[PDB]
Structure 1
Amino acid sequence: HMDAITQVPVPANEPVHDYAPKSPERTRLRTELASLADHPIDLPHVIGGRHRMGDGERIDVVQPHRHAARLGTLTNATHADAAAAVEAAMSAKSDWAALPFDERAAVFLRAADLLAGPWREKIAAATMLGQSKSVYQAEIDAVCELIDFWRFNVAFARQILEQQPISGPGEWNRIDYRPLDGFVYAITPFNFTSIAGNLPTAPALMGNTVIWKPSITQTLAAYLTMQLLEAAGLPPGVINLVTGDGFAVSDVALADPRLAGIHFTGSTATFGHLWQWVGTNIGRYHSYPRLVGETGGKDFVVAHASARPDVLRTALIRGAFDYQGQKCSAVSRAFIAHSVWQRMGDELLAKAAELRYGDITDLSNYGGALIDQRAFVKNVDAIERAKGAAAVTVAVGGEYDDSEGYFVRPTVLLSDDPTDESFVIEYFGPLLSVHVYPDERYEQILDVIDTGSRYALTGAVIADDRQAVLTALDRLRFAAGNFYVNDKPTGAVVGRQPFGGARGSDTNDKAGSPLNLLRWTSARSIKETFVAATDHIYPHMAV
């Protein structure tokens, strides 16, 4: 037993290592890079703690910047593999939910310290190699953000647990944060090793069990993430990894009456498809399935006449070209005051021209390749559509070559008129559209942005002038979900920029605050009355 009201350790953001030359973390990284690249492995399903290749199609996972180089081979989950994954989750449920919160949380605090130290460069490396991330992009994702999700989620959970009610005289009211009945299906994207780790573990912390279907191109890091959790003491069957395209896994998972919920990422249309499925089929489920996730988007930057040019320039380059524009959203549209364009236009383009994309094992590169052949094709199409469109010049970039890796150069489009949002969402890649507007039209450009922005997760204003900043904060209040003043608009740091979403979204329960964790619990109130009534009659009834 235990007689205590315990505290969890206090989280803080994990520091980002730089991997500068001569640094020890850089030497460690090269060891890990060579080790993963030179020793490709089977990437098996992990079900009830057993690692097994299955009977489905074998699919290679390769380095996107060098696609002839194999990192591993997975088998596409069959229906049978998925049914086994589910049975394993249901079978581990009882022992996992009975562990006290403090002991489930130690698993993830431990996993976090393991990722911060001895696993750090292995997980960074795996993310670099599979997902074509520069070391800095791997470090802010697979190390830091994943570490922070675990440590802050443990703190968020613990805070949820002490949210208790008032007891009136003669009674005692308490609240019990129950885990869900049934299993949770986590489907994770290629873009972040952190999201891939978090979507399955967050519900797990609150006492649930999980089946987890990672994106094929992220599966090296996902499998390693699974080994890390096992080394931290995650029990068998609490999370069950199934590799592949996910088709057979969804057939099975969505037909099972024990589906408690789905933690995923996707478009508005994906959400509506799932709503439609679950609403139509609601009588088939024991519980009402919970559908918790976030979308992608494309973002914008507006520079006022007071914008600092070098700040603006650097925000556009990073915002648009960090990770080859493949974050959950990237900067696709810049609106730049004419006088500020005269000062930094040429520098933007020259630097964009010099910006090196190549093999990420060469640490001098800024970034790597696009994630796969389908992504490449989408970019090529968007470039060809721009070369032949009226409005648009290709001012720099637009070259591409899939012979060695899925390489697309940084590309700046100049549009004579405000760039239409519908074009920029058809791909994810290093393509930035710029529209130069007359300084005195700042307010009109803000209205144009507002009126033509349905798909931005984030926006930024660059301006030293306070009225200009405030006017943007007012006028674009609903045009994006996270807003930035004098920096690139980008991925949040955990605990710092929670929430957001594109216009009209309902996704404030996504990862990054306690609201996510709540979705993985079902609270009940318990009341005890000490001396209840012994007569049913009420004072109003007396003669």
Structure 2
Amino acid sequence: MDAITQVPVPANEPVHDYAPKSPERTRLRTELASLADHPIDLPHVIGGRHRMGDGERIDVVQPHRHAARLGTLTNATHADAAAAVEAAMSAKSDWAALPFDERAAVFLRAADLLAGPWREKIAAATMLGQSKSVYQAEIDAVCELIDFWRFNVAFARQILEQQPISGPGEWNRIDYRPLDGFVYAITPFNFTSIAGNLPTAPALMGNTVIWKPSITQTLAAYLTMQLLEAAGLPPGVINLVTGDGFAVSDVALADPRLAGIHFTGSTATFGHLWQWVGTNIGRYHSYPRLVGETGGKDFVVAHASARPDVLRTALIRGAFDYQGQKCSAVSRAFIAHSVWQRMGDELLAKAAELRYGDITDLSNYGGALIDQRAFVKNVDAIERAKGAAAVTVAVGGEYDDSEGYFVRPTVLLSDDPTYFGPLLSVHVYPDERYEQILDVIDTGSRYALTGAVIADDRQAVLTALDRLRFAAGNFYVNDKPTGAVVGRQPFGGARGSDTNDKAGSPLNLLRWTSARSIKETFVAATDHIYPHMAVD
């Protein structure tokens, strides 16, 4: 080929509503039945071979109906992890040798397969295994994943045209090489889009990968692998290993060819990996690149000029969409007294009526918590709230793990302005102490991922944007601080983090390259003496 080609221009994928009478609702019912009725083995996918391993069998179930099995995986053994690392290294040369456009076409094809014939299949696997309502599944497993793929192809293509200046008599170029060695992607339960992106973003740039998805997301992870295969992903470029990850990390973190880790999950797990890499630093051929993001909890401050209906809705969605389990959910709200007088009883009444249940009933707002450990952590929190003098349970606080891991939307009233779940703490503050509340928030700002101000008053909005500039990584005005859309709300991260390079911008993709400069000089010097040396 003699060409300087351009990739298709990305736009965000439209979100389907699955309203009654819509055709996508019919298709979704069909896929929900198909997956829930035919539970399957969920194998490792190594070198293109789908195989169960010799580790412990672990059932993947519907969290909202936990006796209902969706499939069964095997806990990866050391042998399975070693096979995945070898397959990733054996696939590297043919994959890195493919031209960029052929690598990009796999992910553009995967995007259009997910937008069209696989759409409800992947949305249903996510609803079932992760206990997401259809809306929560549509924005995540379908739209966000599609946009990661289309946008990362466009961001990669933008990176490749960033080229230097050529002086007279020379030509300077930059080549964005892939890394040496394999990348290890470790992905969380809560987003099928993150789970698909972490391994595929480095692959787009010519790397190969071993991918360890969260057990409770593995139905959608495996269907994602099938989809990628259907798009033409060559065997071994991504290798899926199932289970709790412990034997995989034993192998991967000991291998000298480890080039990077792409991680999203808890700070505790990230810290363990970072320590391990550091301890082993002397054995790696390359300095391993550790990239990703950890969670946090978000706050909302409503000024006396807040619209009460906007605030009520932002709080209900922000705290209770996907049962509070989004990488960030609204956990703490600070509301001016005069606004609480206008919307406080309505918030508690709507929270008390909010329906959580089996998400194959599309009328439910949401489902259950992801697994028994999450449920235990939520019960411990609610019982701590009931026993703490500073907090009252205003609505909710009931829980029952008999059918599914169900916890009710809970609103706590906290008299003192000083784990994921459907819990919201509200502190009501006198209207004239808005600036003082902003100070309190800033002083308590360690695990602050996102913040929002609700205020029609422009001075109040600017005061919040300024006073809390360093107190949160993403800031929202008159909306809930949840729901970031690829291309639209990149960046942030908790205060003090170094996560500018997380997914959603070209800076992530650059982490999976090692740029070299190439300089050709056309008529270089043929005498070494310099002008200053002359006599004189």
Normalized against structure 1, the TM-score is what?
0.98
C-alpha deviations, 1:197-220, integer Å up to 9, x for none? 000000000000000000000000
- CA-CA distance at 1:270 after TM superposition: 3.7
- Distance in 2 of aligned mates of 1:322 and 1:241: 29
**Inter-CA distance 373–272: structure 2 relative to 1 (3 Å threshold):** closer
Write the distance in 2 (CA, Å) between the matches of 1:283 and 1:248: 21
Partners of 1:152 and 1:492 in 2: how far apart? 14
Q: Contact 2:182/2:207 (CA < 8 Å) preserved in 1?
A: yes
Q: Distance in 2 between matches of 1:396 and 1:432?
A: 10
SS of residue paired to 2:364? coil
In structure 2, the partner of 1:78 is 77
Counterpart CA distance in 1 for 2:273 and 2:395 is 41
SS of corresponding position for 1:417: coil
1:267, distance to aligned residue in structure 2 (A): 3.7
The SS at the match of 1:221 is helix
Shift of 1:23: 0.6
What's the offset of the Cα at 1:540?
1.2
Separation in 2, partners of 1:71, 1:379: 24
**Deviation of the 1:275 alpha carbon:** 3.1
CA distance in 2: counterparts of 1:532 and 1:507, whole angstroms: 43
User: Is the CA contact 2:452–2:478 (under 8 Å) kept in the aligned structure 1?
Assistant: yes
- 8 Å CA contact 2:310, 2:478 repeated in 1: yes
Between the two proteins, what is the percent identity of the paired residues?
A: 100
Q: For residues 101-146 of structure 1, what are the alpha-carbon distances to aligned partners after superposition, in whole Å with 9 as ceiling and x for unaligned?
A: 0000000000000000000000000000000000000000000000
Q: Hey, what's the Cα distance between the residues in 1 that align with 2:437 and 2:374?
A: 31
Q: Give the 3-state SS of the residue equivalent to 1:329 in structure 2.
A: coil
Who is 1:183 aligned against?
182
Q: Deviations over 1:443-486 (max 9, x none)?
A: 00000011012112111000000000000000010111110000
In the TM superposition, what are the counterparts of 1:451-490 in structure 2 within 5 Å? 451-490=443-482
Structure 1 position 81, deviation (Å): 0.2
Q: 2 CA distance for matches of 1:127 and 1:305?
A: 40
Cα distance in 1 between the residues matched to 2:518 and 2:277: 31
Q: In 2, distance between residues paired with 1:529 and 1:56?
A: 58
Runs of 4+ in 1 over 4 A off after TM superposition: none
Q: Spell out, residue by residue over 1:409-428, the C-alpha distance to the aligned partner (whole angstroms, 9 max, x if none).
A: 00000011114xxxxxxx21
Q: CA deviation at 1:541?
A: 1.2
Confirm or deny: 8 A CA contact 2:256 2:285 kept in the other structure.
yes
Deviations along 1:37-82, one digit per CA (max 9) or x if unpaired, are 0000000000000000000000000000000000000000000000
Q: What corresponds to 1:54 in structure 2?
A: 53
Deviates more, 1:61-70 or 1:281-290: 281-290
Distance of 1:30 and 1:182 partners within structure 2: 43
Per-residue CA deviation, residues 244-299 of structure 1 (Å, 9 max, x unaligned), is 00000000000000000000013444444333322332220011100000010000
Q: 5+ unaligned residues in a row in structure 2: which ranges?
A: none
- Secondary structure of 1:457's counterpart equals strand
- Distance in 1 (CA, whole Å) between partners of 2:428 and 2:279 is 49
Separation of aligned partners in 2, 1:300 and 1:248: 38
Asked if 1:540 is matched to 2:525, the reply is no
**Separation in 1 of the partners of 2:168 and 2:200?**
40
Name which of structure 1's ranges 267-276 and 7-16 shifts more when overlaid on structure 2. 267-276
Counterpart for residue 358 of structure 2 = 359
Q: For each residue in 1:314-360, what CA deviation from the matched residue of structure 2 results, as whole angstroms up to 9, or x when unmatched? A: 00000000000000010000000000000000000000000000000
Separation in structure 1 between the aligned mates of residue 51 and residue 9 of structure 2, nearest angstrom: 38
Structure 2 contact 299–451 (Cα < 8 Å) conserved: yes
Separation (CA, whole Å) in 2 of partners of 1:540 and 1:447? 62
Distance 1:316 1:172 in 2: 57
Q: Which whole-Å CA distance do the structure 1 matches of 2:138 and 2:366 have between them?
A: 13
Given that 2:322 and 2:367 are in contact with CA atoms closer than 8 Å, whether structure 1 keeps it comes out as yes
1:474-508 Cα offsets, whole Å, 9 max, x none, are: 00101111100000001310000000101111001
| Cα deviations by residue, 1:149-183 (Å, 9 ceiling, x for unpaired) | 00000000000000000000110000000000000
TM-aligned CA distance change 1:77 to 1:138, over 3 Å: same
For the aligned residue pairs, the C-alpha RMSD in angstroms reads 0.7
User: Conserved in 1, the CA contact under 8 Å of 2:212 and 2:242?
Assistant: yes
Secondary structure, counterpart of 1:403 in structure 2: coil
TM normalised by structure 2 equals: 0.99
2:275 and 2:125 mapped to 1: Cα distance?
37
- Residue 517 of structure 2 is matched in structure 1 by 525
Preserved CA contact (<8 Å) 2:254 2:280: no
The number of aligned residues is 535
Aligned to 1:110: 109
What SS does the corresponding residue of 1:274 show, helix, strand or coil?
Answer: helix
Give me the whole-angstrom Cα distance separating, in 2, the residues matched to 1:189 and 1:279: 23
Given that 2:267 and 2:295 are in contact with CA atoms closer than 8 Å, whether structure 1 keeps it comes out as: no
SS of the equivalent of 1:260 reads: strand
**Does structure 1 conserve the Cα–Cα contact (< 8 Å) formed by 2:187 and 2:265?**
no
Distance in 2, matches of 1:63 and 1:324, equals 15
